[PDB]
Scaffold this active site. Structure first.
Site, PDB file in Angstrom:
ATOM      1  CD  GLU A  35      -2.914   1.144   2.308  1.00  0.00           C
ATOM      2  OE1 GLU A  35      -2.976   0.135   3.040  1.00  0.00           O
ATOM      3  OE2 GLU A  35      -3.793   2.031   2.298  1.00  0.00           O
ATOM      4  CG  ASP A 100       8.273   9.288  14.402  1.00  0.00           C
ATOM      5  OD1 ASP A 100       9.289  10.012  14.341  1.00  0.00           O
ATOM      6  OD2 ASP A 100       7.120   9.736  14.228  1.00  0.00           O
ATOM      7  CG  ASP A 102       8.373  13.538  16.485  1.00  0.00           C
ATOM      8  OD1 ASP A 102       8.882  13.801  15.374  1.00  0.00           O
ATOM      9  OD2 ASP A 102       7.246  13.015  16.603  1.00  0.00           O
TER      10      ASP A 102
END
Lengths: 391, 258
Positions: A35, A100, A102
């Protein structure tokens, strides 16, 4: 919009990304059933795109011309044929284990910048987080086929593509995330919940982060020079109420002592308070609190939403950040955000040279090409080992 | 020195319950009555219903054990030599396969309840019975040299667990037990629940598990094989449809879970 069209038609490395996501020079289900999602300047967002080949991938991304596109899971059937399927018939099989980080999660102790702003002074947080994460991925889990990617403004994304890593289920991904997630509560008004004696992961991470605690936290950032911030973040990590009250009173009488000075005041006041036979135990508890403070301040901080599901979509490498204009390049631990290329600069360089290899983007393309070559070699070796085991 | 020198069904179930627990591995044979079919299924269904009720009430293993253990002597006896009790247990499980293979929700609920009952009954065993039962299932320990090389990391991993789970508050006692303890090496994905809690040591993609832990692997193998058998049992439900006298009973049994 025209700049993005030029970027996809001139600069984006579709071949290397195709080889990474397909795990093969020739097409396979790893690209046909993968996808992809596209985000547009109109505010539209389209899911369930998939591509038959590198030519189809490049042509469709060029034709749509999105601001960015995002990478999802490999499915049992092509996502582009979802109109031929019931919603329960389209199912995921694999996706790269992604983490991830940040910069905004470190604002409890960062001072030089706040929010989505960044600079080389605070990116040492991300560099140490990448170092600890890489040590965990290599030594604990045995991964080798992974690469870090700059988020474009404020973070770093690690894309793990090992076959055993790609095959993890949602439960397995959540448990891996829990294994690497140590600071599970971001609030500053408590000591960490970690049990003692340390698990070897925690001990090794602490020993890796100890040499950088002084230079980064106490000197570079220096968040505890503010007495109220120290009382709100540094003191609650300590084990004793009398120690906390003594430090609070002393700093309110003697304000604006730096983080290094307060760090020494903790030891001095604890030594003054805890004399007697129990002094060794109190010293041990104080040392435990300081070690937990090192982990609390410098350990990797992670976004759980990216890792906790296989079907999640994340901004692909070499995308353009819509606000900053930076390229979402691959990176390593020595990276800082000031080193990232920008779309306008790359357009200028291409106008001057008309060759991608002479732009500032080519070292990052070289890193990604080397990573893809290593990934393909390891994939072929794994296939050979599996065939020999079957034989 | 001096020296000297159907029945098959009964022997089968004596063999199956020698370990006192079974993975429910083999096809039953011979005959029982239809009243026995209904009543035995309902008894096991009652125990599993109470297990699921307590789990929905978020009660601990000790509380569930206190609640369920008195019910075995009435509904589903355990740790028993009786052929009738053994056949009752085995046949009731096999009947609830046919009741609960019908859908994914029923399969999940039945697997959860039966695996928790498996855990409860395993806890009731002596350590010798547990060892024999594990060995009978044909279920890699590390070398002493590898233990010595990794001794610091393994001891750091298990020392808290030895104190809290085995009550070894004294560090001396923990050291002696660790000297006597064995460890198992396997891929980390197989024990990922212990990985998420950081209860095992990880090295190069392999998890190092002490011998006094690892029952989750046994119960997970039980659950996985039961799920696969239920999927198989689902595929040949059309053969069950040849006897109409059984379908109302199975519909009644499944109605309590819907």
């Amino acid at each position: 919009s025209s700049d993005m069209e030029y970027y996809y038609k001139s600069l984006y490395p579709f071949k290397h990304i195709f080889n990474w996501l397909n795990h093969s020079p020739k097409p396979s289900r790893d690209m046909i059933n993968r996808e992809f999602a596209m985000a547009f300047r109109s505010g539209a967002y389209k899911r369930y795109n998939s591509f038959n080949s590198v030519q189809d991938f490049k042509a469709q991304i060029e034709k749509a011309n999105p601001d960015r596109f995002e990478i999802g899971a490999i499915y049992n059937k092509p996502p582009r044929e979802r109109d031929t399927l019931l919603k329960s018939e389209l199912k995921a099989l694999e996706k790269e284990l992604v983490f991830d980080i940040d910069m905004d999660d470190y604002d409890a102790f960062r001072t030089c910048c706040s929010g989505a702003q960044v600079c080389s002074k605070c990116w040492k947080f991300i560099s140490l987080a990448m170092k600890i994460t890489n040590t965990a991925l290599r030594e604990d889990f045995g991964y080798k086929d992974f690469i870090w990617v700059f988020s474009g403004r404020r973070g770093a994304h690690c894309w793990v593509s090992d076959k055993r890593a790609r095959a993890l289920t949602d439960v397995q991904r959540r448990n891996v995330l829990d294994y690497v997630n140590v600071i599970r509560d971001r609030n500053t008004d408590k000591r960490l919940a970690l049990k003692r004696p340390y698990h070897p992961h925690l001990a090794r991470s602490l020993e890796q982060l100890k040499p950088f605690f002084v230079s980064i936290m106490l000197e570079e950032q220096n968040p505890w020079e503010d007495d109220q911030h120290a009382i709100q973040t540094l003191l609650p990590a300590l084990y004793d109420k009398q120690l906390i009250d003594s430090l609070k009173k002393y700093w309110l009488d003697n304000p604006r002592r730096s983080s290094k000075e307060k760090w020494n005041d903790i030891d001095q006041i604890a030594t003054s308070l805890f004399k007697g036979p129990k002094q060794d135990s109190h010293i041990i508890k104080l040392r435990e609190c300081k070690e937990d403070l090192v982990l609390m301040t410098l350990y990797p901080k992670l976004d759980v939403e990216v890792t906790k599901q296989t079907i999640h979509l994340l901004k692909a490498p070499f995308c353009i950040h819509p606000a900053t204009g930076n390229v979402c390049v691959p990176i390593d631990e020595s990276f800082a955000p000031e080193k990232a290329p920008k779309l306008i600069d790359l357009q200028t360089e291409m106008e001057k040279n008309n060759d991608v290899s002479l732009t500032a983007l080519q070292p990052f393309i070289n890193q990604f090409q080397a990573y893809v070559s290593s990934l393909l070699k390891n994939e072929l070796g794994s296939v050979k080992r599996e065939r020999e085991d079957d034989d | 020195m001096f020296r000297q020198s159907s029945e098959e069904e009964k022997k089968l179930y004596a063999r199956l319950y020698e370990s006192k627990l079974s993975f429910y591995d083999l096809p039953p044979q011979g005959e029982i009555t239809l009243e026995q079919f209904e009543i035995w299924a309902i008894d096991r269904l009652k125990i599993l219903l109470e297990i699921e009720s307590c789990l929905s009430r978020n009660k601990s293993i000790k509380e569930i054990e206190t609640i369920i253990k008195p019910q075995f002597q009435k509904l589903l006896p355990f740790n028993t030599e009786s052929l009738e009790d053994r056949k009752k247990d085995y046949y009731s499980h096999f009947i609830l396969r046919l009741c609960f293979c019908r859908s994914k929700e029923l399969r999940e609920k039945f697997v959860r309840a039966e695996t928790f009952l498996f855990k409860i009954r395993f806890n009731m065993l002596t350590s010798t019975d547990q060892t024999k039962f594990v060995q009978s299932l044909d279920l890699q320990f590390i070398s002493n040299e590898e233990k010595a090389e990794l001794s610091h990391q393994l001891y750091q991993t298990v020392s808290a667990s030895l104190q809290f789970q085995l009550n070894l508050n004294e560090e001396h006692q923990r050291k002696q037990y660790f000297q006597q303890e064995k460890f198992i090496k396997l891929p980390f994905e197989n024990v990922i629940e212990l990985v998420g809690n950081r209860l095992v040591f990880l090295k190069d993609g392999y998890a190092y598990l002490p011998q006094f832990q690892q029952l989750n692997l046994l119960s997970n193998e039980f659950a996985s094989k039961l799920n696969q058998e239920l999927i198989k049992t689902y595929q040949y439900l059309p053969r069950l449809n040849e006897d109409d006298r059984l379908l109302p009973i199975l519909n009644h049994l499944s109605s309590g879970y819907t």
